[PDB]
Design a protein around this ligand. Structure first.
Ligand SMILES: [Mg+2]
Ligand SMILES: [Mg+2]
Ligand SMILES: [Zn+2]
Lengths: 512, 510
């Protein structure tokens, strides 16, 4: 059939995968490996253990060690005694006791080894709006919004049955939103809040109430709407928790959609999204019409390039550039989700002379990324032909978590040419043979550099041995070295070792 | 402090040309040998045939195939003195067999055709193209619009350009002062005198100017008003250097072109060698403890800036705005040293004041002024990124002297071993589900099998105890690296007792 489904794959404890499919076409992928958890925005219930009116704070045990550091400015009124006497409100001894119990969120994990900074002022974020149910002060509309939008937005913002004593924030992605579309994302949030408290009195101790980092909860909260037919799961220990979670987000209606999968064929291959999860791992993703896009990664940005197909019987180059650039706005948008790419992205669309064809593509792109859960901001095609854009780094991308740095080229895509580099070494040797008190000079190098430096540049090496006389210049071949790597060590008179040339790598792997 | 040109022609495959203010490097070309080209070469050539049918003429410039000079391309100076235009002319009347002419090559040889010629000579410098033979030519490039095109048409019309001549101002000239343009012009002129002197000094077919030559290109592209000496470290080159500077009509400079006789090689005497190695580093240190990080890409080039190792104090607003002015300077240089072309993208440190953002854009626009290549520059945008474009004069440094890493094919990354086992491990579970099937064979890199058969041991057993009567063999292979693999299947009936370590050579041989 054709249906919006959510597929979860939890067989290998090494990787939990959450695909979201629309029919038979994969829309978004999410991946968790265990360890190395980011416990930011997590909510617990914990016990005060150490009052300290000198730091104006209180260590709190929540079930991790060390306690975690809670300042007084971050304490809501509900945790003060019956009545309060304002003498500045500054002493902790006057606000709370040891062994009290409090609901707590992480505001800074966990810089240093010091406990993690905490706040009783809880923030529950969404696609549209951030509900802080503990704090009437804080409330606003995102800075990015302006124009008639702010007036329209702030006129659809007050129209809301928002409980008295909570305060909420509208988000970048909230513009244009309808007056009852914003109560749709607000019921989601304060249903959560009732469940966070339900599970707060539920039991006493320190325990985890909301786990912001977790793939499923993140994927339940952002994508679980009623056009999702099923939520197929293949590991029953995971389906148990998948229910405990949706209980916790306060939405136990949808719990019914959570079927289980027992079929023999591995779940993703049955539903035939396994090929498309592998185009996540490519570089050159072919497009439906023989075009291609090409995704590169650099220190602090990410760059895509569009290529058309090889020109075919003299067609129209402008309706080909246009048609390819539309197809690539679709795919760049999908690929941003499959890779969980985060930071500034930059795109080189094919050039098109009309302003009507550029706005067509920038639109096709705003649309394609509209339902993208993460914040996305876009600019317009520039003087040079580049579109800049940004995407919120929630999670680690496939590069950070399923890839590592190339051993040979050390990041770059390249290795210096052999001759180019050989010469670089030839002078780097001489540079060290023309110092004073230099008995020998050793140069461990890839087998083809050694080969080049001692046949085609043999005369140049010999030339160094005669100019600065007495200086033995030893160039070693090595099985354990490829084209970008070399060592060039110097030896001092009296430091001479009667060592063989082929034994010098074993003697110097120490050095190294 | 004197600005010098160092040439380094000791090694047979690498002429290295550097430019140094004192011992500060600021330019460089690393030209490999071979690959000569004839276009734009200037010859003296006897006319040899005349063929009205084509409204042309043929010229023996001294190549095997005579060249093809059309009527459309004949300066009026070669016309017979007694000449009456009575309509567009036929060429009988204009040229005679045996006439000597100064010719330039404007298309090379196209199979069995011979090179098209012109007597409308053009002498391109870095910034200008003098044209001593048509005053009808002129004006400015069409890729300069704006207050950049009017700032030219002024410094252009303040140049002392003789009667009969013409002058195209080039793209690379945008930012240049009237004094550099006035200096480039006076060198195209002196060159045009030499040419006429040499064409009169010897009646012939010979070669007068070799536009493509490694030495000529180095004087055009870096021999500039304020260059004090040219220190060369090969007698042979030095004798060529002097011949070319005499034929460029600066025959008096020939004496500044000194030799170098040292045991310490030249660039290491001026202690520049470490700065030339900076041009192949991916990261470059900055004076005040920062860094820049240049990374190439299919379509553009991408620079990141990083601030000092640490900030002792918290005037974080004056450590950011300084590291970013250093970066303008070192990028501008570093663009020159690598001859980087195409689109570049810079990610400066974020500064909150727009007055600081224009400060940087301005430093950078001033520093790419002494570059011979036109460099347009945008504004630090809403996302902190300054876009900018530089002109392709040459394939770049990492284009000529670099190739594509083989581990990853350009990526920068290889897939982790846990991510890639689990993929293989699903493709085994596919093949092994089939009806046809009896065994299934994976041939995988040594550490992948180490992973599948140890951490994922139980998961392979499960693939076997389920699919009842199917074997899963995972064989390590020395011969096979970080990314590659094979997953092969065996229909029921056709096995061999072929052991598991001899199973690579079986299937390999198949
Ligand atoms: Mg995703
Ligand atoms: Mg060059
Ligand atoms: Zn590599």
């Amino acid at each position: 059939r054709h249906m919006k489904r959510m597929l979860i794959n939890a067989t290998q404890q090494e990787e939990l995968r959450v695909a979201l499919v629309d029919g038979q076409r994969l829309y978004d992928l999410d991946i968790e490996s265990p360890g190395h958890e980011q416990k930011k925005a997590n909510i617990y219930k914990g016990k005060i253990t150490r009052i300290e009116p000198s730091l104006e704070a209180a260590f709190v045990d929540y079930g991790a060690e060390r306690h975690g550091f809670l300042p007084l400015k971050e304490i809501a009124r509900e945790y003060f005694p019956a009545n309060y006497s304002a003498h500045g409100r500054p002493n902790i001894k006057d606000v709370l006791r040891e062994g009290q119990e409090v609901i707590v969120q992480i505001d800074k994990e966990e810089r240093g080894n010091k406990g993690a900074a905490l706040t009783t002022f809880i923030s529950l974020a969404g696609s549209y709006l951030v509900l802080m149910p503990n704090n009437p002060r804080a409330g606003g509309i995102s800075r990015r919004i302006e124009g008639d939008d702010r007036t329209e937005l702030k006129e659809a913002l007050a129209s809301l049955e928002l409980p008295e004593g909570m305060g909420l924030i509208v988000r970048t992605a909230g513009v244009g939103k309808s007056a009852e579309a914003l109560q749709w994302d607000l019921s989601f949030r304060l249903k959560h809040w009732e469940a966070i408290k339900k599970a707060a009195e539920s039991r006493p101790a320190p325990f985890l109430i909301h786990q912001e980092s977790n793939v499923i909860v993140r994927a339940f909260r952002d994508y679980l709407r009623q056009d999702i037919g099923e939520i197929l799961i293949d590991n029953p220990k995971v389906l148990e928790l998948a229910r405990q979670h949706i209980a916790a987000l306060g939405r136990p209606d949808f719990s019914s959609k959570i079927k289980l999968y027992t079929g023999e064929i591995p779940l993703f291959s049955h539903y035939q999204i396994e090929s498309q999860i592998e185009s996540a791992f490519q570089r050159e993703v072919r497009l439906p019409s023989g075009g291609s896009i090409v995704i590169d990664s650099t220190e602090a940005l990410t760059a895509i390039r569009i290529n058309s197909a090889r020109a075919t019987r003299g067609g129209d180059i402008e309706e080909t550039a246009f048609n390819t650039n539309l197809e690539a706005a679709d795919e760049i948008a999908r690929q941003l989700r499959l890779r969980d790419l985060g930071g500034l992205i930059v795109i080189r669309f094919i050039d098109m002379t009309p302003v009507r064809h550029q706005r067509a593509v920038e639109n096709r792109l705003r649309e394609a990324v509209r339902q993208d859960r993460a914040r996305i901001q876009i600019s317009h095609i520039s003087r040079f032909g580049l579109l800049e854009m940004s995407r919120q780094r929630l999670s680690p991308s496939l590069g950070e978590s399923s890839h590592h740095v190339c051993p040979r080229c050390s990041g770059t895509g390249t290795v210096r040419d052999n001759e180019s580099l050989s010469l670089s070494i030839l002078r780097l040797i001489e540079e060290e043979a023309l110092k004073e008190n230099t008995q020998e000079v050793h140069a461990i190098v890839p087998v083809p550099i050694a080969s080049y430096l001692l046949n085609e540049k043999r005369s140049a090496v010999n030339a160094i041995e005669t100019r600065q006389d007495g200086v033995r210049c030893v160039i070693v071949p090595n099985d354990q070295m490829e084209t970008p790597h070399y060592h060039v060590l110097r030896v001092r008179k009296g430091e001479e070792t009667p060592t063989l040339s082929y034994m010098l790598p074993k003697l110097h792997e120490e050095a190294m």
